[PDB]
Amino acid sequence: AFRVLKPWWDVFTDYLSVAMLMIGVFGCTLQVMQDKIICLPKRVEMKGLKTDLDLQQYSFINQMCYERALHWYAKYFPYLVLIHTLVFMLCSNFWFKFPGSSSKIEHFISILGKCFDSPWTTRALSEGEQAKALFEKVKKFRLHVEEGDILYAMYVRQTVLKVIKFLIIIAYNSALVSKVQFTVDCNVDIQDMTGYKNFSCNHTMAHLFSKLSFCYLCFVSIYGLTCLYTLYWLFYRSLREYSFEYVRQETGIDDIPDVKNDFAFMLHMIDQYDPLYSKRFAVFLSEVSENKLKQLNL
């Protein structure tokens, strides 16, 4: 189910994405509740000024104001939060398990699942026909996957997209997150239908839709930085053509070669989850054990 190959450079991002969707859900709920703007007519003991206006007129006032005095973001922030969150969620997860190359990753998953528990591997690390069948599958998988370049340039594309969107989001929420102000001074000209021209407006949910904005800014900064670290690892160790050189001096069989391309990426990544399936794969990825099993079967 691919859960084996998922570096900590790809799980904290999923968790932070869940949190972002949660903040968006709370914001959407809040904007669902409440009553929005509640504006009154300015007049440009302590008995009060009888405004004298009928209720539908006040609904006309409080509808004209909340579409001619509230800025680009302050009225529709929750929608932007949800859109960016869904974009990031789809971009990260679905990228690798795409349509173009879903087959190779799944088949490598199957081969790794088989070779993780090979009985002949257990014996040699201290069934024979099974070892031969596994060797055949390994050789075919090598000739098919190692002869490949797809599953390499999809993680680079996904991380690049994620980092680009992180930059864009920080930019957008930078500027227009200082224009969410409670008081406002609407000056519209609904003057013959209503009677009082210039009116004052005091949005209801602005305190929250500033604090939620601060929190979303923090979470987006964290996810941006983590994607930054992944983009750092992905281009500072040349993780193509991995090297089972320490494996050779580590296990004794000094003929185990170095896989390349998609095999290299799969190994270097699945190395991060648990640095032990590398040995179990390298066991079947050696030629001398093949002839040894051939002799033993005889």
Contact residues for a copy of itself (CB under 8 A)?
A: 6-8, 11, 29-30, 32-35, 38-60, 63-64, 67-68, 76, 98-100, 103, 106-107, 119, 122, 125, 133, 136-137, 140, 144, 182-183, 192-197, 200, 202, 204, 207-208, 211, 272-274, 276
Structure token pair of residue 286: 């050696």
Distance separating alpha carbons of residues 202 and 176, to the nearest angstrom: 18
202 bridge partner residues: 183
- 120 vs 265 by CB, closer to a copy of itself: 120
Nearest to 205 by CA among 7, 35, 78, 5: 35
Tell me the three state secondary structure of residue 199.
strand
- 68 vs 237 by CB, closer to a copy of itself: 68
Distance separating alpha carbons of residues 177 and 166, to the nearest angstrom: 16
| Shortest reach from residue 55's CB to a copy of itself, in Å | 7
Residue ranges of alpha helices (H) inside 116-207 are: 119-125, 128-141, 155-175
Structure token pair of residue 117: 């528990």
Structure token pair of residue 51: 């405004």
- 26 vs 258 by CB, closer to a copy of itself: 26
Residue ranges of alpha helices (H) inside 42-154 are: 55-64, 77-96, 102-115, 119-125, 128-141
Nearest to 216 by CA among 5, 23, 9: 23
| Shortest reach from residue 155's CB to a copy of itself, in Å | 17
- 201 vs 285 by CB, closer to a copy of itself: 201
| Shortest reach from residue 189's CB to a copy of itself, in Å | 10
| Shortest reach from residue 151's CB to a copy of itself, in Å | 13
- 204 vs 221 by CB, closer to a copy of itself: 204
| Shortest reach from residue 229's CB to a copy of itself, in Å | 12
Beta carbons of 216 and 23 less than 8 angstroms apart:
yes
Residue 169: other Cβ atoms inside 10 A: 22
DSSP state of 67: G
- 133 vs 164 by CB, closer to a copy of itself: 133
| Shortest reach from residue 125's CB to a copy of itself, in Å | 8
| Shortest reach from residue 43's CB to a copy of itself, in Å | 4
